[PDB]
């Protein structure tokens, strides 16, 4: 790196260093801590969605086992490094079959993002894992479990990293606010958690952008409005008004309301579609075909939007689909 840690992005500045700084995965953290505290470390696998703390957890565990010099006592490989059959057959085998250079102890191999590895390399890894288990332990990290071969999964003990809970996100936000000398409104925190979707990376990025947005962060307070302008996301009031107009007004009024709401702050149609879907999924529809039509048509519109197209036609299609689907309610 260069200069102090204050030059780093918040996603990297607040990376957990120890195992007590990881939040939202209490069960997994406790289990791994107990395993490391008694020498009962098996071949580990961490399966989870993006931005949940798998890499942070494994690096913290390696630091706990070895110490500050963990980088000189582990073999860490990821998607940026070639991991072909030759690599598995030579480099990994040599690392697993040899003693530590610096200080005594067992050998740890961290194959981060192993789901990117080919089937041949994973197959070659089988006996490598099973033969040097006396002195070596393997850790695998994955987001998609369908890419891993059945045998490799069979040889590993699985741990699932759940989407981050609300309480853990609030505690981390409190720590970040205290360190950064920031003030966050309760509704601002609510909006941040809602838009995070269980990812701490999104929380930290949005909070950094909000801090940048404030003119005088020293005594200014971050409000839900700041989040909405920073992210460009529709306000809940805007979504509610659009849905109300679509559901109990004529086509002209609905079109005018949608256009005005979108042009007030330059909102995107995709965010509106997601918001309306979230609102409608809480509705109690009398008829199932209403929900079926809503889901099918909105999914089609979302797929069409994903490839460009005409924005006005797409908005009119959204309005018409909602109206037609709700006509079935009677």
């Amino acid at each position: 790196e260069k200069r102090s840690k204050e030059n780093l992005p918040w996603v990297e500045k607040y990376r957990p260093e120890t195992l007590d700084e990881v939040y939202g995965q209490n069960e997994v953290i406790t289990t791994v801590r107990k395993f490391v505290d008694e020498g009962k470390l098996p071949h580990l696998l961490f399966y989870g969605p993006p931005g949940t703390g798998k890499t942070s957890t494994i690096v913290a565990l390696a630091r706990e086992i070895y110490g500050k010099n963990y980088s000189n006592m582990v073999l860490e490989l990821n998607a940026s490094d070639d991991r072909g059959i030759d690599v598995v057959r030579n480099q990994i085998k040599d690392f697993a079959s040899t003693r530590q250079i610096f200080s005594k102890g067992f050998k740890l191999i961290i194959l981060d993002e192993a789901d990117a590895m080919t089937n041949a390399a994973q197959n070659a890894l089988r006996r490598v894992i099973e033969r040097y288990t006396k002195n070596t332990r393997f850790c695998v990290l994955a987001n998609y479990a369908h890419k891993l071969t059945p045998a490799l999964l069979s040889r590993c003990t699985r741990f699932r990293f759940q989407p981050l809970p609300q309480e853990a996100i609030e505690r981390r936000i409190a720590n970040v606010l205290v360190h950064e000398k920031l003030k966050l409104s309760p509704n601002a925190e609510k909006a941040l958690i809602e838009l995070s979707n269980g990812d701490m990376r999104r929380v930290l990025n949005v909070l950094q952008s909000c801090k940048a947005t404030l003119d005088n962060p020293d005594e200014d307070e971050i409000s839900d409005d700041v989040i909405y302008e920073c992210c460009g996301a529709p306000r809940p009031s805007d979504l509610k008004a659009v849905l109300k107009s679509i559901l109990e007004d004529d086509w002209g009024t609905a079109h005018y309301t949608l256009n005005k709401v979108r042009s007030a702050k330059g909102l995107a149609l995709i965010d509106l579609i997601e918001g309306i879907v979230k609102i409608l999924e809480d509705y109690e529809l009398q008829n199932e075909e209403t929900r079926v039509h809503l889901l099918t048509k909105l999914a089609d519109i979302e797929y069409s939007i994903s490839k460009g197209g005409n924005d006005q036609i797409q908005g009119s299609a959204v309005i018409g689909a909602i109206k037609a689907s709700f006509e079935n309610e009677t």
Binding site: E1, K2, N69, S71, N72, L75, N90, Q91, D94, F95, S97, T98, R99, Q100, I101, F102, K104, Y132, K134, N135
Partner: protein, 257 residues
């Protein structure tokens, strides 16, 4: 400039780099007022290389403050090949440099070739793994060690070294057969350059990969003798002494099982 170090003959640095370019990828130099000390670890984390070129090997060596330089041996060798084998070589660096300057000068003519190699942000420590008290320390001509390694590696991919009282044994057990070479200490006053010395504390028996020894033996072109220090629970040290510095290979033995 902050650091200015002149090699009278570029062949010296080319040979020193040639001694360990086949076993490591990224090297880290750390220049001080007492010379240039460099470290390099291999991709498998099984072999470490430590070089300690001294200030007596340069025509003039000036270094104000310690300076770190992370480099890739492939690019360094590529550029060093550019310069001729009859020209003086100046290594130049500035405060917190972004590049290292290699200046080839031919006093015969007025031709000056300056090459700037961009540095890498390699942040690591040396840890000075030089375990105090080893179990056995032997010294013998590099030619004999190279011959033994080349002969035995053709039998097996693993070579076992046993140190017993006045006995050094190299054993290989392959598929077609096995091969054992036994050498005992001896001294010749007429030609001490060929003598073999052994100082023993406890018996030693350590296995090593043939590929790493084949890589290490390439340093015999720099020194006529090699010193091998072995100790259980510690990596094996293979030292080749130079005019003012030395080149050390720390090789981790294989797990016994």
């Amino acid at each position: 400039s902050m650091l200015e170090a002149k090699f009278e003959e570029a062949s010296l640095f080319k040979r020193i780099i040639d001694g360990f370019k086949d076993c490591v990828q990224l090297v880290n130099f750390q220049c001080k007022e007492d010379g240039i000390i460099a470290q390099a670890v291999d991709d498998s984390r099984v072999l470490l290389v430590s070089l300690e070129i001294g200030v007596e090997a340069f025509q003039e060596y000036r270094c104000d403050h310690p300076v770190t330089l992370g480099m890739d041996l492939t690019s360094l060798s590529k550029i060093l090949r550019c310069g001729n084998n009859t020209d003086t070589l100046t290594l130049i660096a500035d405060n917190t440099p972004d590049s290292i300057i290699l200046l080839f000068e031919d006093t015969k003519k007025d031709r000056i070739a300056e090459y700037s190699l961009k540095l890498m942000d390699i942040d690591a420590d040396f840890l000075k793994i030089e375990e105090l008290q080893y179990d056995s320390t032997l010294s013998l001509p590099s030619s004999e060690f190279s011959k033994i390694v080349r002969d035995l590696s053709q039998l097996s991919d693993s070579i076992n070294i046993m140190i017993t009282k006045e006995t050094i044994k190299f054993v290989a057990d392959g598929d077609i057969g096995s091969g054992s070479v036994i050498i005992k200490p001896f001294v010749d006053m007429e030609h001490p350059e060929t003598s073999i010395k052994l100082e023993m504390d406890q018996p030693v028996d350590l296995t090593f990969g043939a590929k790493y020894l084949l890589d290490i033996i390439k340093g015999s072109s720099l020194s006529d003798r090699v010193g091998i220090r072995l100790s259980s629970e510690a990596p094996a040290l293979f030292q080749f002494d130079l005019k003012s510095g030395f080149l050390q290979f720390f090789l981790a033995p294989k797990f016994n099982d």
